[PDB]
Amino acid sequence: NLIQFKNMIQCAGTRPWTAYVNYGCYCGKGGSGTPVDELDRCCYTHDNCYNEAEKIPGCNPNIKTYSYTCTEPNLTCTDTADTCARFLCNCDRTAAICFASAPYNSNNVMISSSTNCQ
């Protein structure tokens, strides 16, 4: 669930989802080339993760609503029976934590056309 993902972001970190709407080569719609930094790699993994999520029967990363708890700055995925929800919550929680731990080089903000994003 895209809504849950952005709420899962401010739980683990300080930067809201808007800080990431367009950063590096992979944060934001689609993605190409090689990640530029640690954060961009966070996004790179998240995408490959959603791509994986689609290989799960009746599993759509945008709409699927999972279960999780936030004891700031702690995230916990409670699902264990529902694979999609489990796997999907996993993708988001990983990304959210990754984002908060990674640095934010405002320089790599909006370089989608630079030679770096092959």
What amino acid positions are annotated as catalytic residues? 46, 92
Q: Among the residues of the chain, which ranges form H helices? A: 2-12, 38-53, 83-101
Nearest distance from C-beta of residue 78 to Ca ion, angstroms? 26
From residue 5 to residue 44, what is the string marking binding to Ca ion with x (rule CB under 5 A)?
Answer: ---------------------x----x-------------
- In angstroms, the CA 4 to CA 60 distance is 14
Among 37, 38, 47, 82, binds Ca ion (CB under 5 A): 47
Nearest distance from C-beta of residue 74 to Ca ion, angstroms? 25
Nearest distance from C-beta of residue 60 to Ca ion, angstroms? 16
3-class SS shares of the chain: helix, strand, coil, % to 5: 45, 10, 45
Residues 93 and 25: beta-carbon distance below 8 Å? no
- In angstroms, the CA 93 to CA 8 distance is 7
Q: Residue ranges for the binding site for Ca(2+)?
A: 26, 28, 30, 47
Give residues in contact with Ca ion (CB under 5 A). Answer: 26, 31, 47
